[PDB]
Amino acid sequence: MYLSKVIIARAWSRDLYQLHQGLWHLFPNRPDAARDFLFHVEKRNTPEGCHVLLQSAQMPVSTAVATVIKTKQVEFQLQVGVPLYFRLRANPIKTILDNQKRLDSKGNIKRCRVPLIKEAEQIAWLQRKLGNAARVEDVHPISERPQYFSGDGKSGKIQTVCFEGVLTINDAPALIDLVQQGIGPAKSMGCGLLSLAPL
RNA sequence: AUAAACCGACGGUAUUGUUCAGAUCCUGGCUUGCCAACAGGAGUUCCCCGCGCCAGCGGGG
């Protein structure tokens, strides 16, 4: 597992799709299939590009558009019952089936993921996702701008929520699994990266 | 097919050498951009795949 800080040129950073496709070229294997990586956008505006915190299973190699600043080999050593700081940009949703009777490819009724617009439901979603791995001691749900994107031929939305707070570890391997694999949908759109720190 | 018809105005040639546009000059003095203002109602968020479905839960992009 490798943790890095990467910057992407503005000309290759208009949509989250462009961020994904641009970050992709740091690991040349086809088809891996991958992503074996997660990332979190901290600064969105140029120059030089957009700053990103990239967790991966390989060592990134800088390209023309994607520039690595620092790289780290890291082993998460988590102890039980220890208070920690956490940050997680996530996509809290509810899969429901459409009030409009739109049709998918199979001729059945289409489903839609909808944002949870109430704090209680978001926090409930969070502690639910964590489960027996950890218990949320304190949480700040930061409301973000709705993100839009393009490609391949579809224009869609990703409403994100940025959780920042304190938690306590109950089970370490489960939490390591949560960090490594990611939490929630839109993992390719810069969600699911759980960042931890000591207080 | 007409004072028409047939029917070259043709050949040869550096415009050349010399030349500071120079010296003098504050654009200065006087100026509030002020008065009024919840962003809140909203769970739609576009494409696949697996398992559910008076519910929905996930995995990819």
Curated annotation (Swiss-Prot):
Cofactor, how bound (note): Does not require a metal cofactor.
Record's function text: CRISPR (clustered regularly interspaced short palindromic repeat), is an adaptive immune system that provides protection against mobile genetic elements (viruses, transposable elements and conjugative plasmids). CRISPR clusters contain sequences complementary to antecedent mobile elements and target invading nucleic acids. CRISPR clusters are transcribed and processed into CRISPR RNA (crRNA).
Known outcome of mutating residue 20 to A: Loss of pre-crRNA cleavage
Protein name: CRISPR system Cascade subunit CasE
InterPro entries given in the database record: CRISPR-assoc_prot_Cse3
Induction remark: Repressed by H-NS, activated by LeuO. Activated by the BaeSR two-component regulatory system, possibly due to envelope stress. Part of the casABCDE-ygbT-ygbF operon.
Gene Ontology MF annotations: RNA binding; RNA endonuclease activity
Gene that encodes the chain: casE
SMART domains in the cross-refs: CRISPR_assoc (SM01101)
Cited Pfam families: CRISPR_assoc (PF08798)
Domain of life: Bacteria
Gene null: resulting phenotype: Loss of resistance to bacteriophage lambda infection, loss of plasmid silencing. Decreased levels of crRNA, increased levels of pre-crRNA, prevents pre-crRNA cleavage.
Oligomer status and interactors: Part of the Cascade ribonucleoprotein complex, with stoichiometry CasA(1),CasB(2),CasC(6),CasD(1),CasE(1)-crRNA(1). Interacts directly with crRNA, CasA, CasB and CasC. Stable subcomplexes of CasBCDE-crRNA and CasCDE-crRNA also form, both of which are able to bind target dsDNA, and CasCDE is able to form R-loops. CasCDE and CasCE complexes have endonuclease activity. Interacts with YgbT (Cas1). Binding of target ssRNA or dsDNA causes a conformational change in the Cascade complex.
Family: Belongs to the CRISPR-associated protein Cas6/Cse3/CasE family. Subtype I-E/Ecoli subfamily.
Catalytic activity, EC: 3.1.-.-
CDD domains: Cas6_I-E
Residues making up the signal peptide according to the UniProt record: none
Keyword terms of this UniProt record: Antiviral defense, Endonuclease, Hydrolase, Nuclease, RNA-binding
GO biological process: CRISPR-cas system; defense response to virus; RNA processing
Cross-referenced Gene3D superfamilies: Crispr-associated protein, domain 1, Crispr-associated protein, domain 2
GO cellular component, as recorded: protein-containing complex
Keyword Cell membrane: no
